[PDB]
């Protein structure tokens, strides 16, 4: 791909984070803590899952960023509406305001309804995410495999401002403690 020149500097929004997440000083890394991280509750925090939003809001243009997923067993990545549900149980779908892919139990899937199997020969260590607001496109790229396409959501109905979306996943296994990291430009 040739989307690198739309690179944007993403930072994480602490106020949206599940109360167990630990965000680095530079707001570029996030991991699951082993306990509640001693913050007050608020209506923005994702309550049920280890999710957090980027601070940036996008309503036009083309945007690109990269995320490091090295040695994780489970994670979700993509974008979502600013007004997505924060509390209780929900599925990641375009109907609910999410455009995402994930790793779960050694398989990669796109968050369609129902979910779509992805075909990845080289397990990615870094994922590129491209958003074209006007075109209604969200695309995912395998940076480990020379930028190869993973998945394209087209005919997207954003219906609001978009925010970068992250889920570090649970760590029931003891094998999923590693962080998500926003990679430098």
Q: Give the residues lining the site for ligand NUA (CB under 6 A).
A: 94-95, 97, 153, 155-157, 159
Nearer to ligand NUA, 118 or 125 (CB): 118
Q: Measured from the CB atom, is 86 or 181 closer to ligand NUA?
A: 86
CB of 10 to ligand NUA, least distance (A): 21
Pairing of strands 51-53, 116-117: unpaired
Q: What are 37's two structure tokens?
A: 């991280």
CB of 136 vs ligand NUA, minimal distance in Å? 7
Of 143 and 156, which has the nearer Cβ to ligand NUA? 156
Which residue, judged by CB position, is nearest to ligand NUA in the bound state? 94
Residue 152: both structure tokens together: 């394209």
DSSP letters for 59-112: SSSEEEEEEE-TT-S-EEEEEEETT---SS-----TTTTEEEEEEETTEEEE--
Residue 135 vs 185, nearer CB to ligand NUA: 135
Please check whether residue 128 is in contact with residue 140, taking contact to mean a CB–CB distance below 8 angstroms: yes
Q: How far is the CB of 149 from ligand NUA (least distance, A)?
A: 16
Of 75 and 153, CB closest to ligand NUA: 153
Long-range contacts from 106-110, C-beta under 8 angstroms, 24+ separation: 108/150, 110/140, 110/151, 110/153
Q: For tokens 């925090």, what's the residue?
A: 45
Minimum CB distance to ligand NUA, residue 125 (Å): 27
In the complex, least distance from residue 87 CB atom to ligand NUA, rounded to whole angstroms: 18
Dihedral sign, Cα of residue 53, residue 138, residue 160, residue 185: positive
Beta strands at 116-117 and 107-110: parallel, antiparallel or unpaired: antiparallel
């Amino acid at each position: 791909h040739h989307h690198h020149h739309h690179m944007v500097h993403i930072t994480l929004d602490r106020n949206t984070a599940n109360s167990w997440l630990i965000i680095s000083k530079d707001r570029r890394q996030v991991r699951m803590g082993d306990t509640h991280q001693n913050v007050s509750d608020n209506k923005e925090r994702f309550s049920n899952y280890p999710m957090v939003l980027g601070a940036q809001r996008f309503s036009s243009g083309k945007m690109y960023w990269e995320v490091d997923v090295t040695q994780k067993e489970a994670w979700d990545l993509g974008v979502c509406r600013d007004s997505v549900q924060r509390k209780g149980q929900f599925s990641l779908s375009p109907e609910n305001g999410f455009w995402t892919i994930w790793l779960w139990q050694d398989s990669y899937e796109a968050g369609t309804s129902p979910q779509t199997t992805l075909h990845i020969q080289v397990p990615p260590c870094q994922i590129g995410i491209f958003v074209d607001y006007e075109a209604g496109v969200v695309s995912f790229y395998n940076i480990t495999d020379h930028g190869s396409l993973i998945y394209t959501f087209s005919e997207c109905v954003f219906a609001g401002p978009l925010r970068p979306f992250f889920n570090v996943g649970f760590n029931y296994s003891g094998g999923n403690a590693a962080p998500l990291k926003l990679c430098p430009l």
